[PDB]
Ligand binder design. Structure first.
Ligand SMILES: Cc1n[nH]c(=O)[nH]c1=S
Ligand SMILES: [K+]
Ligand SMILES: [K+]
Length: 536
């Protein structure tokens, strides 16, 4: 039967299926299209999803949430140590691996984060099975773009424990782009910014899409920013208002604060569609009814620093991607908090009035994209960057990937050593900083360089690609006009789309190491007479 797409979120999970030409987001047994990523252990039973979230106040020590924060991580990781302080449940160290420790049926029990996430995935699998009336095994599960191999493998393991065959682990921003069909657009490469403010995290991702291939250029954000922060600002404001009006602090009473927080959450949602919301609480504290109102402008003022602060990760991602804001072709809004009008206005104003992609429910877009990809898995531009080896085994790119063909690019190079008699032109294809990590396509030598000090000889290297995709690489000694050249054949089927994707993924995985590495060689246009990779 059809594979499902699952957004395994920090706070909630969402499951969708592509059937009958459309994606259907599947509601749970309580009629909810999103299910809380919560697992609760009690004296008599294990609760998953809505039931677990509903009883959290009654059973805080044994209600687990935020397993995504621990997944694929070591106990001594700084993130784990800081996060544990904010959790009611215990996290224990089992041989360097974090485990949640809870009381279940009168017995102490410990679970790895992948096991807790497997329980959430089991609920999502069961919700899909109830809707489809058939067993669901195949699934595509989404993860944040910044997740490392350990976090990705642990997420896959959670699906495997749940009995799911994880066809692929895909980035949440990529899933959102697939939901908007941004990978179906034939033509020149497009730069896409995904603004994801929901699920307790703020994620900004910049992607480039061409020929159905996605590359993550940059990621930025705040792992501890979400709607709860906006609700807290309202709760503190109301606590102050009650204290000023009634000379009473309701902070001591946990239920009164809980009732106020629930009213604030509802009011914030009303403020997305209306300019004012009513707060009506009977007997909030000491028998005093709290009936009041909040304007959208007051809500915006209470959260002004948080809302404006969202632009700082957008600026950082643009800087990391080496792109101006004008170079973004598509902006996608993901996450429930993107419904807030002030956030939409701030982002649109930053982008000079550019329209935002927000037609898909922001809570369901990632699952929607995952479902589209799962169905695909169930049934001219350059593919890779082209360049030559410079001194130190460095990849110097003459043609970036996603360059339309035919194309011709020329750069000038020099000798690295004094009285260097010749240069070796080594042609490589790939996105890595060092040639050892890229693919060698061919090599040729330009000999007879007249003796000169290093940096004086000028060698012009030209990469020419025809419409058929054939690459001709030539080098000319600008002092004599002497030349040498190689023709590199483009075998049809030499590279699969998956082969290209793997090369792009490797660049994304080693981006920090490669970006730091580029700084090491001083010249960047100097050629040696030998292959660095063959040097002992
Ligand atoms: C403001 C807001 N936040 N989250 C959500 O799910 N909806 C809304 S309208
Ligand atoms: K996810
Ligand atoms: K997010």
């Amino acid at each position: 039967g059809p594979a499902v797409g699952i957004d395994l979120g920090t706070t909630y999970s969402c499951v969708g299926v592509f059937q009958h030409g459309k994606v259907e987001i599947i509601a749970n047994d309580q009629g909810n299209r999103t299910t809380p990523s919560y697992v609760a252990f009690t004296d008599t039973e294990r609760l998953i999803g809505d039931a677990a979230k509903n009883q959290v106040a009654m059973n805080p020590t044994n209600t687990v949430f935020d397993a995504k924060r621990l997944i694929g991580r070591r106990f001594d990781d700084a993130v784990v140590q800081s996060d544990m302080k904010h959790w009611p449940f215990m996290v224990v160290n089992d041989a360097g691996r974090p485990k949640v420790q809870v009381e279940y049926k009168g017995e102490t029990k410990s679970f790895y984060p992948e096991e807790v996430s497997s329980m959430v995935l089991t609920k999502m699998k069961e919700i899909a099975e109830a809707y489809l009336g058939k067993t669901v095994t195949n699934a595509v599960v989404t993860v944040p773009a910044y997740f490392n191999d350990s976090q990705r493998q642990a997420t896959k393991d959670a699906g495997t424990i749940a009995g799911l065959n994880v066809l692929r682990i895909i980035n949440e921003p990529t899933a959102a782009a697939i939901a908007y069909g941004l990978d179906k657009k034939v033509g020149a490469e497009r730069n896409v910014l995904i603004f994801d403010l929901g699920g307790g995290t703020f994620d900004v991702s910049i992607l480039t899409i061409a020929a159905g291939i996605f590359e993550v250029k940059s990621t930025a954000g705040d792992t501890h920013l979400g709607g709860e922060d906006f609700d807290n600002r309202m709760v503190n404001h109301f606590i102050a208002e009650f204290k000023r009006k009634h000379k009473k602090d309701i902070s001591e009473n946990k239920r009164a604060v809980r009732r106020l927080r629930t009213a604030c959450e509802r009011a914030k949602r009303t403020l997305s569609s209306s300019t004012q919301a009513s707060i009506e609480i009977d007997s909030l504290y000491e028998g005093i009814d709290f009936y009041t109102s909040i304007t959208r402008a007051r809500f915006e003022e209470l959260n002004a620093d948080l809302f404006r602060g969202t632009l700082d990760p957008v600026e950082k991602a643009l800087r990391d991607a080496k792109l101006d804001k004008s170079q973004i072709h598509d902006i996608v809004l993901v996450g429930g908090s993107t419904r807030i009008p002030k956030i939409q206005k701030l982002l649109q104003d930053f982008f000079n009035g550019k329209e935002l992609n927000k037609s898909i429910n922001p809570d369901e877009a990632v699952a929607y994209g995952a479902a589209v990809q799962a169905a695909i898995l169930s049934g001219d531009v350059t593919p890779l960057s082209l360049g030559i080896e410079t001194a130190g085994g460095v990849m110097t790119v003459l043609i970036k990937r996603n360059t339309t063909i035919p194309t011709k690019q020329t750069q000038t190079f020099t000798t690295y050593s004094d009285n260097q008699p010749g240069v070796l032109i080594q042609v490589y294809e790939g996105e890595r900083a060092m040639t050892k990590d890229n693919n060698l396509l061919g090599k040729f030598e330009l000999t007879g360089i007249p003796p000169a000090p290093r940096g004086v000889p000028q060698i012009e290297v030209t990469f020419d690609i025809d419409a058929n995709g054939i690459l001709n690489v030539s080098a000319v000694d600008k002092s004599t006009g002497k030349e040498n050249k190689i023709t590199i054949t483009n075998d049809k089927g030499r590279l699969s789309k998956e082969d290209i994707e793997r090369m792009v993924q490797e660049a994304e995985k080693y981006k920090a190491e490669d970006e730091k590495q580029r700084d090491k060689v001083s010249s960047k246009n100097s050629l040696e007479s030998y292959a660095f990779n063959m040097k002992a």
